[PDB]
Write a protein that binds this ligand. Sequence first.
Ligand SMILES: *C(=O)C1=CN=C(C(=O)O)CS[C@H]1c1cn2c(n1)COCC2
Length: 363
Amino acid sequence: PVSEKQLAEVVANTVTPLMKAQSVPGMAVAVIYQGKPHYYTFGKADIAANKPVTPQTLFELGSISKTFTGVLGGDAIARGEISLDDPVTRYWPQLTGKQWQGIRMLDLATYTAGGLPLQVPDEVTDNASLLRFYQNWQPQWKPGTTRLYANASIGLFGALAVKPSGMPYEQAMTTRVLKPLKLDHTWINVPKAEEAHYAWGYRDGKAVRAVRVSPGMLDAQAYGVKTNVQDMANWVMANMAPENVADASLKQGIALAQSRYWRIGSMYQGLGWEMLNWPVEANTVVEGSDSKVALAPLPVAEVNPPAPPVKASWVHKTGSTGGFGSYVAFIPEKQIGIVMLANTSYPNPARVEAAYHILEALQ
Ligand SMILES: *C(=O)C1=CN=C(C(=O)O)CS[C@H]1c1cn2c(n1)COCC2
């Protein structure tokens, strides 16, 4: 098997050319191998201040936030608070438009409601205006027919999924997912004392960080998760090996998020997480990551009933913000995984290629 020495070489020999080519100021990587995380840090968290990346540097996860949403929703299912087969309207009775009949919580969670757009528009500034948006929405497709990746879909799922708990999303997430997993440096809102750890993002040479949206059902979730490479490694480990998670509903929620709900070409949609059967070749995964494909409306095949987690899977998620680019992938059958956090948003295919190359060294 590969030694720790060899693994360190593989990671450096992969990441250093990638950062040069993609002009990445700083990256934190964790590889999960032989039951533990291995950490590698590169470059700068803050160029002007000459602060290096460390295992405590906070990065913006962007859309990898959706994996936390998915698990939180799974946990709520396992508690009996929601069911994926319930109508959206069960959790939002004020949503009276008849276009919503036949749209399930599952459809919101997995982007199959029938054309909810990528973004919630900026006109949406509060709950009254969020309601007007969803009430006015005209589906382009029937439910359960077309996948269109969308913050307006899973964001609403997250907001509604926590309603029975009585907690807002940020508090539900922290209480039910983060704290039990000891992810104690994972934030929506970075506390003031934690600010020294927060990297700057870089976009066309400008230092940038995430903004917020207007207050409401989606605020905390849109502001997106920030975390360091250690917490993210432990997040990957929990999702790779939920058998080691003691809380019964959270263990089940992790499994629900890695279940297969829909097939779309060579991939399968989970709750937040996406999956391909393992073995998979690099070009399959890399080509599917291009935004011309990843953001396209594509036909789905229902997996009814949902398939529970398949150990021989490539499980992954990309996520970006204006200044950050991150990627996570793991293969439960092999008990290997990787986290790559960077403070520039560089092309998703390049992230997948590097992650694949590193994990390939370990099988
Ligand atoms: C997730 O990583 C993600 C979410 N969705 C959108 C979007 O709502 O516009 C686009 S794909 C991706 C994303 C979001 N941002 C970027 N990429 C780049 O920085 C701006 C925010």
